[PDB]
Structures are given as structure tokens and as C-alpha cells.
Amino acid sequence: SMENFQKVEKIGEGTYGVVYKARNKLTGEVVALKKIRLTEGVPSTAIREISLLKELNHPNIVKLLDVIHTENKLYLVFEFLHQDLKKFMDASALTGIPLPLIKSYLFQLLQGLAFCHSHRVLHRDLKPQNLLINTEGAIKLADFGLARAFGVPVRTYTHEVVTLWYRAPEILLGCKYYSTAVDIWSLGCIFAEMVTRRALFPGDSEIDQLFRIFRTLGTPDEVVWPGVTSMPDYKPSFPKWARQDFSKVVPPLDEDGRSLLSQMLHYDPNKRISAKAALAHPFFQDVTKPVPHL
Amino acid sequence: VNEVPDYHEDIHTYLREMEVKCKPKVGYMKKQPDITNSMRAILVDWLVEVGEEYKLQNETLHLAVNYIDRFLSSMSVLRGKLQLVGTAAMLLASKFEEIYPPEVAEFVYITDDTYTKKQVLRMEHLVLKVLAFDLAAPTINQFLTQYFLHQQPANCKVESLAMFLGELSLIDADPYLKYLPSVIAAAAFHLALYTVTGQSWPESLVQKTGYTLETLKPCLLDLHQTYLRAPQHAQQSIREKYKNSKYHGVSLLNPPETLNV
Ligand SMILES: CN1CC[C@H](c2c(O)cc(O)c3c(=O)cc(-c4ccccc4Cl)oc23)[C@@H](O)C1
């Protein structure tokens, strides 16, 4: 089963299990082996991750090659990607990421995310540790451990969902329903983070996180967001901060960039831009596919 | 955005393609030496009680029945094990679909200790191997909820009646295994719309689906009968369930005598 594979290096670990870099002895292909943690049978995170990744086949989504199910181990075999966007941003702390590469990566992330949403899948955990890059200029969505298949229209799903810093306001405010818009919020926070090299809303509790969002975009009312003051966790005592101009939120960013960023971060999920629509934004008029500069 | 305007058409096209790949063998029951359409009906009725008892989503029940029919399309099973297959399918569907699935121990309790926890867990593993982890199947519900967005205006009794008719179709392999989920759902929607309001399968749903009253006619005839005889059926757990006010007491409405079709 694992007889064809030679382990090369342990490259990550967490609640999920552990990942190794490995080599197929007969074909030469370099793979990632994600060994899943094993109570209550096969975990639901792995059932969902496997069944959805088998349906999703796209150049900006990680490719599941095989599943090895020993009855005592569970390994997912993936095509290998060398580094995550978090580690790349930290390694580019000295003078930052060039604008052509920022454009290429965001363009690719939107293709991949549009493909998920066209196939009725929400990711629900987009952030730089879960976005992987290679030596040829590609970037891909990874870690589908939190993903879920959705119906049309959606019903109520799990409330404890996105990592806090990247979590949309409709989740923070305890709405009954959420949809594809939560993944767009996260990508908007990631876009800012690639331009500046630090998180846009780094809160330390749910309430701190809301107040940080309000201090940048302004406290929402009934005019900018119909129904906001009727939501389960909306407090009338919330402070009324003024909306900041967007040139002050991300100073180095040109006019097109700012327009796209603002549509990604719109308060009302119904007005927030779709991934599919964002690919046509003028910010991408001159987009290429450069390789990473490091 | 809860109705995903920029994606519902892509999603519909995809579910249509997937329902053909996830389809059971139509003739599987004839090739099972020890089981029958009648034993399968007892099993599905039992899973409806289990779903009502643990407050499971209807989608969970539909997926479980999909996993069971695909498993039995490839594996021969003795009568004394059919319940073990069903219990593992219901556990897997719960894990896939529910926010809070019951624990493995709660699934051993409802089999009346016919089986062990070790047997339930092994069977879970065997079902995953046989279906190769393809668990994101299209169901009658995934289509029904999309069709509902075409009511003018939305009517709550139409919706719950259609759910009820679709759910009755899961019990009887003959005839319903020969119809795709999207077709059973079109039939169930028309019949519910006509029974409650007197309107018919609309034009906007002809543009979306390609289905006309003409193409839906065979399934609609089978479904009309099932509705008429439903108070006479040996299995009644679906009727008990749709008395409840959560489903607007729709199992109390009276079926129409003819369709004019
Ligand atoms: C917490 N998350 C992180 C992503 C991780 C994951 C995948 O889901 C799928 C994959 O194909 C890979 C991969 O090919 C390489 C790496 C990796 C690279 C550099 C450094 C560390 C790692 Cl782990 O991760 C992958 C995911 O399963 C776990």
C-alpha cells in the first residue's frame, strides 16, 4: 500500500494528523502524504474532505491522487506543493511582494474559489497557511477539512467556522444563514495582507474582532446593510465609528485595487462581489503568471 | 445570496450530471437471493422513525437510502444483516450532513442490541470501501428546494406536501428505482401544486429543466397512485411524521381524484 512510497521529511502537524513529503519509487512523482488521526469510527472531517476533493478537479485546487485505507491508518496522497503563502509573506518581510505576483495569485485564488462555488462547496477556512504555492508560479486552495456541500437555497450550518481574523461579519453577528460570501470576505482580508504583509483585522475575541472591522469600514446601520440591527448578536449600544476612506486603509494600492478590495469587503452579503464576477474586474487587465521571486 | 444567483444554474447542471453517476442498478432486487422489495420497505420505514426520534434532517434520510441502494447494487446481503447495512449508512449520512450527529453508541442502542459496536464500525468501513467515498450524492430534496424558488408566491403547504410525496417514493423500490431524483421531484412538485392550488408545472421550470408534463407523465401516474393508497400501505411512519405542525399537517390533505393530463 505504502510500499511504493519513500518518506523524505515531515513538513507539518496539527489537530488533523501530520503531513510528510514523499517520493514514488517507481514513477518518481513527489507527493504529500496526509496521515489522518484515529472513539467514533472515521472522523466526519475526513469523510467530507475526501468525498468533496474527489469531485473537484481544477488547476488552483489541490489534487487528491489516492486514498489508502488500511483499517488502522488513513492516508490521503496529494500532488506536492513546496511552501504556504504565510511562510512566503514572512520570507518577503524585507521589501515585500511585487505587484505582478500579487495580481497573479489573487486571480488564481478567484478561479479556484469560483470552481468550488459552481460545484456547491464552501471552503470555510481560507487563510494564508491553507494556500499553497510551487516553483512554477501557481497557487492553490488546500485543507478541505472544514468544507461542506451546500443546498440551494442554503440552510443553517455550523456556527464555529472560519479562523477569527478572516471571519465575515454575518457569522460574528450570529445570522441564521450564510453562503458563498463568507469565502469572499476571507479572500479580501488575504488581498490586503499580501499588499501590506500584516493581517487586516487581528482581533483576540469575537467582540474585539467586530470592533476592529467597524473602526475601518464604519459601524453599519440600516442604510448600508438592511436588517443588521435585527440580527441575534447586534447590540444597540455598539459604538458608531465613522467610515474610513479606503486610500487610508491600504495606502500603497492603486485606484483599481481599491475598488476591488471595497467590493470584496462590502457589509451586506447580497451586494458583496462574487468570485465569478471579480475575474472581470479591471484590476486584472494586465495579469500574467510570474514564478515566485524567492 | 442565500439563493446563490451567480451559481444556481452551474449547480443545477452539475447535479444533473452527478445523479446519473450515483444511480443504483434498476434490477438489483431480482439478483439478491435472500431479500425483497418488502424487506427494504420495512428498513426504510425504520430509518424514518430513527430520523424522527433523533431530530435528523430530511436530507440525511435521503442520502442514507442512496448509500443503501448503491451498496446493494454490488453486494449480496443476508436478511439478518440488512439492518446492519442500514445502520452504517445512517451513521455515515449523519456524519456528512448533520451539525450534531448522534454518537456511535446511540446507533447501537436503536438496533435493540441485535449488533455490537465493533460490527457497526466494521460495516462503516466496508460501505466506504464499496462506494469509494463518493458520498456527496444528489437527492430529491436538492432538486425540490431549487424548484420551490419558482412559486408565485411561495406557499408553505405546497412545499411540505411535495417533501411528503418525495419521501413516500423512497419506500417502494418498485417502481421508483427506475426514475432519477430530479424527475421524482418534478412529479412531486406538480402534484403538490395542483392538489393545493390548482396550478400546474410552470413554464419557468420548463426552461430550467427541459421537463414537460408530457415527459413527467409516467412517474406522475405512479406517484398519484401511491398518494391515493398511502393510508392503506403496510408502512405508515411517513404519514405519522407529516401530521406534525412542523410540516403544516399536510398528510391530512385529501388527494385529488384525477389529474387531467
Ligand atoms: C494545515 N493544513 C495545511 C495544508 C495541508 C496540505 C493539503 O491539504 C494538501 C496538500 O497537497 C499539501 C501539500 O502538498 C503540502 C503541504 C505543506 C507545504 C509546506 C509546508 C507544510 C505543508 Cl503541510 O500541505 C498540504 C493540509 O492538509 C493541512
Numbering used by the authors:
A (entry chain A): 0 to 37, 41 to 296
B (entry chain B): 172 to 432
What did the original publication write about this model?
Members of the cyclin-dependent protein kinase (CDK) family have diverse cellular roles that include regulation of the cell cycle and transcription and, in certain cell types, differentiation (Lim and Kaldis, 2013, Malumbres, 2014, Morgan, 2007). CDKs share a conserved protein kinase domain that comprises a smaller N-terminal lobe linked through a hinge to a larger C-terminal fold (Endicott et al., 2012). All CDKs require binding to a cognate cyclin partner to remould the kinase fold from an inactive conformation to one capable of phospho-transfer. We have used biophysical measurements and X-ray crystallography to investigate the ATP-competitive inhibitor binding properties of cyclin-free and cyclin-bound CDK1 and CDK2.
